[PDB]
Design a binder for this molecule. Structure first.
Ligand SMILES: NC(=O)C1=CN([C@@H]2O[C@H](COP(=O)(O)OP(=O)(O)OC[C@H]3O[C@@H](n4cnc5c(N)ncnc54)[C@H](OP(=O)(O)O)[C@@H]3O)[C@@H](O)[C@H]2O)C=CC1
Ligand SMILES: COc1ccccc1/C(C)=C\c1coc2nc(N)nc(N)c12
Length: 186
C-alpha cells in the first residue's frame, strides 16, 4: 500500500494508445498477466487496489467493471459521484493516495496499482518515493496517439528478476512481448 506499482504495456515506439483504445489487437495472454499481477494480494483477507483515470475506466468493457476482486478507484475532476461499480472517486492522485493510507482501509488493502491511462502514469511518475514500473515490452511498432513517459535508467533500475514474473520472450498472434520490472526507491 506504500510502494506505487504502475503496470503498462508499451510498443517499441513507446506507444500506449490510439484513438482511446490500445494500439495493438487484443493480447489475451498479456491481459492474463495484468489480471494476475494486479489481483494477487500478498495476504489472505486483503485485496489489491487499482487507481485509473476516468477515460481508462470507461474504456473497460462494462461487463468487466469494476476490475473483479480489486478495490477500484477512479480519478476525475468533473464527476462528483463514483461511476457505477467503482468503489471510490478521487479528484486528484494525492487525494486517492491519502485515502488509501487511512486506517479504515488498512486491513482491507494490500498492493496499490496504477493501471492507466497516459495522464495518470505521468503524474504517478512525478511522485517522490517508492515506485515500480511493471512494463510489458511489445516488441513491434504500432501507430499511436499517446506515449508512455521516458524511462530514465538513471532513476529506474531494471530488475534482473522479480518474484512471480517470467523473463522469457512471449508470443501471441505473431506479436512478441516480454515482461520487465523497474524500480525507483525511497
Ligand atoms: N498501454 C496500456 O497499458 C494502457 C493504455 N491505456 C490508454 O490510455 C490512453 C488515454 O490516456 P488519457 O487520455 O490520459 O486518459 P485517462 O485514462 O488517464 O483519463 C483521463 C482523465 O482522468 C482524470 N485525471 C487524470 N489525471 C488526474 C489527476 N491528476 N487528478 C484527478 N483526475 C485526473 C481526468 O478526468 P476528468 O477529465 O473527468 O477530470 C482526465 O481527463 C488510451 O489510449 C488508453 O487506451 C489505458 C490503460 C493501460
Ligand atoms: O484498458 C483495459 C481494458 C480492459 C481491462 C483492463 C484494462 C486496463 C485498465 C489496463 C490494462 C489492460 O491490459 C493491460 N496490460 C498491462 N500490461 N497494463 C495495463 N495497465 C493493462
Amino acid at each position: 500500500v506504500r510502494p506505487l506499482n504502475c503496470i503498462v504495456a508499451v510498443s517499441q515506439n513507446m506507444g500506449i494508445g490510439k484513438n482511446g483504445d490500445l494500439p495493438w489487437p487484443p493480447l489475451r495472454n498479456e491481459f492474463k498477466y495484468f489480471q494476475r499481477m494486479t489481483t494477487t494480494s500478498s495476504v489472505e483477507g486483503k485485496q489489491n487496489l487499482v487507481i485509473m483515470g476516468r477515460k481508462t475506466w470507461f474504456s473497460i468493457p462494462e461487463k468487466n467493471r469494476p476490475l473483479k476482486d480489486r478495490i477500484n478507484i477512479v480519478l476525475s475532476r468533473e464527476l462528483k459521484e463514483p461511476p457505477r461499480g467503482a468503489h471510490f472517486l478521487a479528484k486528484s492522485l494525492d487525494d486517492a493516495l491519502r485515502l488509501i493510507e487511512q486506517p479504515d482501509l488498512a486491513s482491507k488493502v494490500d498492493m496499490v496499482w496504477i493501471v492507466g491511462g497516459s495522464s495518470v502514469y505521468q503524474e504517478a511518475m512525478n511522485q517522490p518515493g517508492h515506485l515500480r514500473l511493471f512494463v510489458t515490452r511489445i516488441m513491434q511498432e504500432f501507430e499511436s496517439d499517446t506515449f508512455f513517459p521516458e524511462i530514465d535508467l538513471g532513476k529506474y533500475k531494471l530488475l534482473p528478476e522479480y518474484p512471480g514474473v517470467l523473463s522469457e520472450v512471449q508470443e501471441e498472434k505473431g506479436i512478441k512481448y516480454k515482461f520487465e520490472v523497474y524500480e525507483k526507491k525511497d
